[PDB]
């Protein structure tokens, strides 16, 4: 599908030194197309099979309106290392929550939240339907296409995306034994289910300005114990709450799927949605560094909710050897 160009990228783009920021494998630089002088952004990855899959999948995703568009993909040597240079639609606006943060405040209303969430759910609906899970939907990957009001919200960063099996799930039954069943291993069940969990957690922050997470210090509430603390959640409809809850269902198979989500009235009928204001903009202001902790834990939680397929398997126990294992077996 995608054709990767083999020429020097400098042939085509003036590769500026000014910096757009810092990523995982890449320091992203601003660039310009020579012929057309449009402005873009260049992201680098080291060229291996992991990098080519992120590349491939994010290619396929680029046809979606709410996913950041890949414009071109070069393979050049950069300082003697193979690399995929990836050229991307510039994303001016900044993170989603940094925006809502800054306000007149013209007030932040619940229907805005609904549009913002219909946006992301389109991005996610697109992916799942052609069988891709992003698996890393969080605040730092939802960026705006400019600082203007006419700005579109885009989903970026496929470092973790992967294709999965479209596989209708066990609608887990109402009556069940006291005793614990044998686990049927099937990792592919954490793929799409991870973006639904994401969808929940963001939607929750969107409507109050703080995570559904617990706190370390134990039971001025700024952490929903997966509950909806008044005043912020006083006004928010109870239908919305049922949503957040089906999305945050602990169980991957039991948890809400994206089309069930896109049908939900609070998204679909995004427009006759109660227009109540929300404390989000204000709370987000409140403590700056506390947001920073929201982001760190969202990231760690995503990390356990999804499967690292790039991990070692344990030998059958007998096939194993190590120091302690050889001391004990000796004496046994």
């Amino acid at each position: 599908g995608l054709q990767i160009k083999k020429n020097a990228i400098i042939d085509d783009y003036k590769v500026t030194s000014q910096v757009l920021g810092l990523g995982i494998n890449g320091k992203v630089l601003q660039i310009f197309n020579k012929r057309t002088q449009e402005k873009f952004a260049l992201k680098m990855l080291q060229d291996c099979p992991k990098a080519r899959r992120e590349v491939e999948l994010h290619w396929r995703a680029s046809q979606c309106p709410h996913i950041v568009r890949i414009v071109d993909v070069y393979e050049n040597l950069y300082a003697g290392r193979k690399c995929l240079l990836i050229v991307m639609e510039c994303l001016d606006g900044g993170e989603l929550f940094s925006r809502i943060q800054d306000r007149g405040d013209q007030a932040f209303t619940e229907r805005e939240a609904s549009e913002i969430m219909k946006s992301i759910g389109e991005a996610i609906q697109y992916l799942h339907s052609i069988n891709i899970a992003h698996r890393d939907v969080k605040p730092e990957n939802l960026l705006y296409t400019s600082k203007r009001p006419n700005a579109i919200l885009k989903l970026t960063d496929f470092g973790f995306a992967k294709e999965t099996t479209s596989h209708n799930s066990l609608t887990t039954p109402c009556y069940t034994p006291y005793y614990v069943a044998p686990e049927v291993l099937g990792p592919e069940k954490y793929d799409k289910s991870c973006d639904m969990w994401s969808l929940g957690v963001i939607m929750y922050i969107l409507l109050c300005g703080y995570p559904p997470f617990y706190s370390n210090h134990g039971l001025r509430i700024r952490m929903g114990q997966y509950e909806f603390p008044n005043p912020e959640w006083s006004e928010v409809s109870e239908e919305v709450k049922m949503l957040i809850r089906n999305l945050l269902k602990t169980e991957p198979t039991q948890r809400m799927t994206i089309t069930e989500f896109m049908n939900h009235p609070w998204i679909m009928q995004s427009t006759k949605v109660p227009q109540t204001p929300l404390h989000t903009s204000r709370v987000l202001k409140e403590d700056k560094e506390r947001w920073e902790d929201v982001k760190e834990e969202m990231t760690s939680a995503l990390a356990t909710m999804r499967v690292d397929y790039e991990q070692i398997k344990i030998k059958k126990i007998e096939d194993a050897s190590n120091p302690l294992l050889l001391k004990r077996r000796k004496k046994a």
Binding site: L22, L185, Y190, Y214, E297, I312, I317
Partner: protein, 340 residues
């Protein structure tokens, strides 16, 4: 003593030249990590760059705590320290702290979802968790946040314990003991033993024991297994609001665990019954557990060392940020590599 900048994990990694091939790994949640080849030693190792180390007194203190521990933690089954460095040339330039640890490359969080573990797997895995636990408790440390994603395991089956800095936000408490969750009683080192129980349960089953949502839903699951408290233990409870929730509950007795985990090595169902117990003072200890039958293949009194506890060199000596950023700094330069 010379470094080299590189762009990793939305940061800027200047690190000594002995560590090549930095390839990012992990979530990048709490400090980011990169795998590496260590020329000077020929081994493969991990290199984590702490995040926001000196942003607050909460954070500053938290970093000095964490460093102090890792410098003193020496043990086969707790994560040992291989080096620590810093690109600053004197307290002023100080801003970043990097750890280097031995690379392992899987944690039970992820293994439990890709592999069906055998009883022999579980014996040896939980054995190792208990070995380092015993050692840790000795130093008088309470791990406090022991979960499957905190336990690094490699393929030749060795296990190591990670990540102490609660010894903020947490997304679930599926592994914390009810004592520390609703703070009724106050707590033993046996809090950790509660987690070990849940972990073992999950290894044997492949399912998480108490996957709860809110603190009540979580609490209602715990009790569904271990039965509601008796007036005995309720006496030992702190709160008023806490006692009443209990009585307000359909009072149920503990169903025998051998009825629940059908097809488990009975010797293990038994050790479960002694870890997942509601009363702290009566919960089995790390030491006592090793001597349990399950671990017959692996128990060896003569090789289950303890640590010589270390102090409170400051810890609670309440100081400004520019303060800790110096005590930490010292701990950094004070470091001597372990035996080559």
């Amino acid at each position: 003593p010379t470094f080299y900048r590189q762009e990793l994990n939305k940061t800027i990694w200047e690190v000594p030249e002995r560590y090549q091939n930095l390839s990012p790994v992990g979530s990048g949640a709490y400090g980011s990590v990169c795998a590496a080849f260590d020329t000077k030693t020929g081994h493969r190792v991990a290199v984590k760059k702490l995040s926001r180390p000196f942003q607050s007194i909460i954070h500053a203190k938290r970093t000095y705590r964490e460093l102090r521990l890792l410098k003193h933690m020496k043990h086969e089954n707790v994560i040992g320290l291989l080096d620590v460095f810093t690109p600053a040339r004197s307290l002023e330039e100080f801003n970043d702290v990097y750890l280097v640890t031995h690379l392992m490359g899987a944690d039970l969080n992820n293994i439990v979802k890709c592999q069906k573990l055998t009883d022999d797997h579980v014996q040896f895995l939980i054995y190792q968790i208990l070995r380092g636990l015993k050692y840790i408790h000795s130093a008088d440390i309470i791990h406090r946040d022991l979960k499957p994603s905190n336990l690094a395991v490699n393929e030749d089956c060795e296990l190591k314990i990670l990540d102490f800095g609660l010894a903020g936000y947490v997304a679930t408490r599926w592994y914390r003991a009810p004592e520390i969750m609703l703070n009724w009683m106050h707590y033993n080192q046996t809090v950790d033993i509660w987690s070990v129980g849940c972990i073992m349960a999950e290894l044997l089953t492949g399912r998480t024991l108490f996957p709860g949502t809110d603190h009540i839903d979580q609490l209602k699951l715990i009790l569904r297994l271990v039965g509601t408290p008796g007036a005995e233990l309720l006496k030992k409870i702190s709160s008023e609001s806490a006692r009443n929730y209990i009585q307000s509950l359909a009072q149920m007795p503990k169903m025998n665990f051998a009825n629940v985990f059908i097809g488990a090595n009975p010797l293990a169902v038994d050790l479960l019954e002694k870890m997942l117990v509601l009363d702290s003072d009566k919960r089995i200890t790390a030491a006592q557990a090793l001597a349990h039958a399950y671990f017959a293949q692996y128990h060896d009194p003569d090789d289950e060392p303890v640590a010589d506890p270390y102090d409170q060199s400051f810890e609670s000596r309440d100081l400004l940020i520019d303060e800790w950023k110096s005590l930490t700094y010292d701990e950094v330069i004070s470091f001597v590599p372990p035996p080559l």
